[PDB]
Amino acid sequence: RVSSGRDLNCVPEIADTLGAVAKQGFDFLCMPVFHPRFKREFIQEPAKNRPGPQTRSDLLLSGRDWNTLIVGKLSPWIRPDSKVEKIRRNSEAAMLQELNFGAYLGLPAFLLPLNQEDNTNLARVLTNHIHTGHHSSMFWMRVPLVAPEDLRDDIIENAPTTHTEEYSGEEKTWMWWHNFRTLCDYSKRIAVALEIGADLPSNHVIDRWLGEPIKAAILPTSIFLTNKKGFPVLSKMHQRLIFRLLKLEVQFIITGTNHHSEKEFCSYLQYLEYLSQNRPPPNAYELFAKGYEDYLQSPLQPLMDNLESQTYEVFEKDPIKYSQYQQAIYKCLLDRVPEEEKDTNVQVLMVLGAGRGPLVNASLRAAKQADRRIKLYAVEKNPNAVVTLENWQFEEWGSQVTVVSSDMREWVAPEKADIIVSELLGSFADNELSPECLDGAQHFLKDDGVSIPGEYTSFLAPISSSKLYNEVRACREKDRDPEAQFEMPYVVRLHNFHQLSAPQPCFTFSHPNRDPMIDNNRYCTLEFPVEVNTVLHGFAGYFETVLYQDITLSIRPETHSPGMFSWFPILFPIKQPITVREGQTICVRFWRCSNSKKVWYEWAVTAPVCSAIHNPTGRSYTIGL
Amino acid sequence: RVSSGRDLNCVPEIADTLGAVAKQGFDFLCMPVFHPRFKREFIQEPAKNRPGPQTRSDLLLSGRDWNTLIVGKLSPWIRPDSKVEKIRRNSEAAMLQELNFGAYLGLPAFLLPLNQEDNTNLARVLTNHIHTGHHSSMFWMRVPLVAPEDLRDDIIENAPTTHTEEYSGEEKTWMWWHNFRTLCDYSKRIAVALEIGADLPSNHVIDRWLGEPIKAAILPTSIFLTNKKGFPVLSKMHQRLIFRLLKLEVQFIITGTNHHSEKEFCSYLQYLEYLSQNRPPPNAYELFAKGYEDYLQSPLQPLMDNLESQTYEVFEKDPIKYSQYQQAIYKCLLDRVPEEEKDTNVQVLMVLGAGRGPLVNASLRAAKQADRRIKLYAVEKNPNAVVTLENWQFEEWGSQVTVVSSDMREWVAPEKADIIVSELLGSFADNELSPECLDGAQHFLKDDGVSIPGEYTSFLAPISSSKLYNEVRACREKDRDPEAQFEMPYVVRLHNFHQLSAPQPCFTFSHPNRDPMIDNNRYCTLEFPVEVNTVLHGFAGYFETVLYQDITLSIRPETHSPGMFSWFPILFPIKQPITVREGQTICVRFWRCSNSKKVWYEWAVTAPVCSAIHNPTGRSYTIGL
Numbered sequence A, B: 001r002v003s004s005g006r007d008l009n010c011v012p013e014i015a016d017t018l019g020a021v022a023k024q025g026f027d028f029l030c031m032p033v034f035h036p037r038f039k040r041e042f043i044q045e046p047a048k049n050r051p052g053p054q055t056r057s058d059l060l061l062s063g064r065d066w067n068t069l070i071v072g073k074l075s076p077w078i079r080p081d082s083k084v085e086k087i088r089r090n091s092e093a094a095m096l097q098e099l100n101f102g103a104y105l106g107l108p109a110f111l112l113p114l115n116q117e118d119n120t121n122l123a124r125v126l127t128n129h130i131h132t133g134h135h136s137s138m139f140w141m142r143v144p145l146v147a148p149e150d151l152r153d154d155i156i157e158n159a160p161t162t163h164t165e166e167y168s169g170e171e172k173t174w175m176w177w178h179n180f181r182t183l184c185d186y187s188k189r190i191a192v193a194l195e196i197g198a199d200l201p202s203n204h205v206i207d208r209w210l211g212e213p214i215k216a217a218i219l220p221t222s223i224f225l226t227n228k229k230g231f232p233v234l235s236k237m238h239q240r241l242i243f244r245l246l247k248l249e250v251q252f253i254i255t256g257t258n259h260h261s262e263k264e265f266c267s268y269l270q271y272l273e274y275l276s277q278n279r280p281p282p283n284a285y286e287l288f289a290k291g292y293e294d295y296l297q298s299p300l301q302p303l304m305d306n307l308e309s310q311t312y313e314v315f316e317k318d319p320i321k322y323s324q325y326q327q328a329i330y331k332c333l334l335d336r337v338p339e340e341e342k343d344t345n346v347q348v349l350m351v352l353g354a355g356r357g358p359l360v361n362a363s364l365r366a367a368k369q370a371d372r373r374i375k376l377y378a379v380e381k382n383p384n385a386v387v388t389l390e391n392w393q394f395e396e397w398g399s400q401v402t403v404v405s406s407d408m409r410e411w412v413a414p415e416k417a418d419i420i421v422s423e424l425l426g427s428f429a430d431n432e433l434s435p436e437c438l439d440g441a442q443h444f445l446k447d448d449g450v451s452i453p454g455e456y457t458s459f460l461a462p463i464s465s466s467k468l469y470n471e472v473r474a475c476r477e478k479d480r481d482p483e484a485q486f487e488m489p490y491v492v493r494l495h496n497f498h499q500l501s502a503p504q505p506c507f508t509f510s511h512p513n514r515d516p517m518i519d520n521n522r523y524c525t526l527e528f529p530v531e532v533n534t535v536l537h538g539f540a541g542y543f544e545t546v547l548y549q550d551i552t553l554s555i556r557p558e559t560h561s562p563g564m565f566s567w568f569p570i571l572f573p574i575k576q577p578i579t580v581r582e583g584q585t586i587c588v589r590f591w592r593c594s595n596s597k598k599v600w601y602e603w604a605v606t607a608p609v610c611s612a613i614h615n616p617t618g619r620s621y622t623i624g625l
């Protein structure tokens, strides 16, 4: 179930080592490429002219074994940021040599340590190696939760351990990582191998690593407790951490000697398996979502574009949404039509944007459970979908449903509606121009008519995700602005991220709109109180909608409709990441803009520092009218 | 084995039709999306306001069935290039409607006919559809080998069939295709469905379709002969054509009614299977090559770059090459050392570019079968490979082999060589700068010393491939010249192409070079007599090398070393395709250029029309010294 490997810093025979490791159930082996103690000179004679082979032959394993089962390790003596000029220069040449040999073997990953603050020259050498030739080899940066200096035993007489609560000081290992990856300019080849300590730090220190590219989680043998049976286990603190790490789907590495000598070394791995099996299973949401983790997709525009058959199919495969629509209409029928006017009053319903007709069906079910008479129209502009409607209408529905093949803004209605039902909402509610469409369809609603939905609101929340930022970055395309990708929203299942503040309402719309000279342009200022140090990369967008009264749909995490999976969150990126100290307020500004042809959003951060205004004049992103 | 489908222009029940087709062993079904006879008006009333559904519902099949098993067909009444303005306008609207519905269903392919010369407005509408939205749906252009007018029965009294040999006139259906795809600007979505006739045309007419994107081969039932048993078969003419088509791996479509009424419809398909099984099986070359058909790869530069382990591995997995090297050295030892000086004379061999040491081994085998004494050096600049050499040398070889870790141009030799052995040849021979390296290593050769190889030559041949041209086109990258991809050679297994003329020698090099002030710059004019109409897209490059005397290696098709698969051909593209009439000479000019840092090629076509000079000053492509 769980993908696990073994860290060793001693390999006397490479073939024999693997065999043992593989027999214990490990998937891969982290090991040195040159002997850890084999220190090499590159400048001063005569040690530079040392004869003989420098390491093992590549022939000792097959090409496939190198490619899948081995993870390289930088030798410990290599210190590129040494104060001594000689050791620096030597460590440079040695680092390149080891990294080059790693690429020669075609290793999938290679471990480098972050065990101090200044890793500038380390970063400069690695970056150079990345920009030499072509390779897909990952680089896992070995970085501890807690720095070695901060978890040392208080046993030095004239140098006691810091007994002071230093909020910023306990987050230092993240700052080590942050600076390194910034210098390297957010390379997608550079990821984190997070080393877990005996004493876990405060909760904030761990939350720091949310939204970071964690590929490995190194577990020492020392941190394992022993149970009554006499086999390795972990604390309830560590258990909760491993449970969190299993959601990220990281690869767990075991390092250190067998402290549980009486038992096998498989026991450690068997415990991780034990934890893997013993987790809360994936719900309908996470079942379906499994696959689209942090996958950027362009927001659908069913007005500008005509949706495909299989796009409508996946909409229809959400029974919770339509049951809510069914219930919404059901109640509205009872309110508008009394019991004494059951078979006198026929309500005029108008599904605006009928698609392949899930609402038409729902409206039929709603009328039957209510036991009230209805007259249905099914307005749909997409002519490909209208083919589906008419075939259904001929076979199943009949003359009760009148299929109209038109835009709702254009259509001249032969009758006014008591209810209009729509499904024109995207992940940011109004991103499919539901306001404009329903405004244009408003004239053929009765003066006392109802709209379903009657209201919808969009929400925003600041997020830190070095993953998603790096994902957007990689959406640069030929023949357009170099930074166009940052000035456009994405539909994405947000997974590896950190929500820095609680969602707040952005834009609200009410139908039918009764405000004279109806304007759908907006400008919203939001202030998000941050309680942690972090780096803002964008703003996650959600929405809520009121169908009728107490009938609602929502993708806002705290009020999320259970089971529903018809809308993933939306992501508004920013060009440049913005550092945010604990106590500081993130201030974002959002505009909804329009002309006769297009609608778009612009946005800007104004605190703690200013960003550029994103998507001015909809240059990078527009929504078609 | 063979991928086959069924063409129908009559589908009364879509579900039942598939069942029958699937039971007969067909993989997919070509069918209409709207009823062939269902002609629709879009302008004039009242026919434009025709009620009811326009076609079948998408719900009759599953999404997956549409995506894999159905191929769309444009209705026959749709004529976008009609002389009548009304029929034109109507056919435009209808064409878009059908194409849009095809995309709605998510069909993998869609058939459009090329049954006349002028298909300009057809091309204009299709191109518009391609540039509307995003889809991966292919478009198969139905084009006959022989035009309907040219295969009609000579049964009209006052209009007899052309009994004249019109060389250009019999190639007209290709010109139909050529013009169409040119208008559409070589879209990768547009391919050919070649319709085979009863009487096959002349051989030249068929050769015209070499290097064209043929995805389907439509076979009417009428063209099938009947055997003594009373089941469908094909002529020896058609058999050879199908054998050629099986190499291209096209999908065979069966069209028309069952003329063999007594037998099943599976019999037709079973015959294609019968042919599929009964072909000459793939040799060692085609066995290994299967996968890299028309796959563009960048030429290796083992001087500038350090080759990976698995790059050396695949070199070593060619036993024919080294057996030739073994035999080459074997003979040279016997010539240089007589029988009476068997154990007096030790020959000094020097493998220049030893890699992981296949030649060192071969030199050992060659000396043993010859029974002569040798002293080996193993010069290698790549330090990663030197690790392999030294481990081998320690374990196996010993002090007979002296591993040197240096550039051969730099290395100060402590002894002069009787033989130097090298493996510095690429697909265009001198594209790895074997001339420069061996010139720089020439000083430590004895005055009577031998070089293996002693000579090598590069060859060029003009090719027509609309596939490969379109492949290169798609190698456009951000942040460089828009046409850089055309000014650089590619290593590629040439498959779907047409060789327009016989290869001719381009550049030759002899080692040891004894010409004062050795210049490796060159300028070569070649004239290629073409005997067919075609469109030049590039120049395939090959090479021959003389190891010693009668010991040679070659990838030139006519003199190709049997079994060897260590070099695929190289491809020099051109920016713009060049039309070439039968009888015309293709004149190409090739330069080998250099400065102190780089070596590169430039090239230009000078007849029948001039091209631009490609890669001036090595702007787009250089080979590193």
Ligand SMILES: Nc1nc2cc(CN3C(=O)c4cc(F)ccc4[C@]34CCN(Cc3ccc(F)cc3)C4=O)[nH]c2cc1F
Binding pocket: A288, A289, A292, A297, A298, A299, A300, A302, A314, A315, A423, A424, A425, A426, A427, A432, A491, A565, A566, A567, A568, A569
């Ligand atoms: N009018 C409507 N608009 C909308 C707008 C949406 C959201 N949406 C996109 O914008 C979008 C853009 C894309 F490129 C791809 C997919 C989407 C979705 C639709 C489905 N889906 C969830 C999902 C996808 C995959 C999955 F394995 C599980 C769940 C989204 O995120 N759903 C509507 C339903 C309506 F009726």
Ligand SMILES: Nc1nc2cc(CN3C(=O)c4cc(F)ccc4[C@]34CCN(Cc3ccc(F)cc3)C4=O)[nH]c2cc1F
Binding pocket: B288, B289, B292, B297, B298, B299, B300, B302, B314, B315, B423, B424, B425, B426, B427, B432, B491, B565, B566, B567, B568, B569
């Ligand atoms: N010094 C040498 N140079 C050379 C130069 C070559 C040719 N070459 C490339 O340039 C090249 C460039 C690439 F991106 C990828 C591959 C190649 C090859 C090497 C192997 N191969 C054949 C093949 C590949 C794959 C296959 F499934 C079957 C056969 C080529 O075409 N082979 C040498 C061997 C030497 F000893």
Ligand SMILES: CSC[C@H]1O[C@@H](n2cnc3c(N)ncnc32)[C@H](O)[C@@H]1O
Binding pocket: A302, A303, A306, A307, A352, A353, A354, A355, A356, A379, A380, A381, A382, A385, A406, A407, A408, A409, A423, A424, A437
């Ligand atoms: C069921 S998803 C929403 C549906 O509304 C349709 N739609 C969107 N805008 C309009 C409009 N202005 N008039 C009619 N249908 C519309 C879309 O084509 C889609 O089928």
Ligand SMILES: CSC[C@H]1O[C@@H](n2cnc3c(N)ncnc32)[C@H](O)[C@@H]1O
Binding pocket: B302, B303, B306, B307, B352, B353, B354, B355, B356, B379, B380, B381, B382, B385, B406, B407, B408, B409, B423, B424, B437
């Ligand atoms: C076996 S493929 C050719 C080999 O020659 C080596 N080589 C290429 N140019 C030189 C050079 N100038 N000096 C030494 N080895 C070389 C390459 O590193 C490769 O291993």
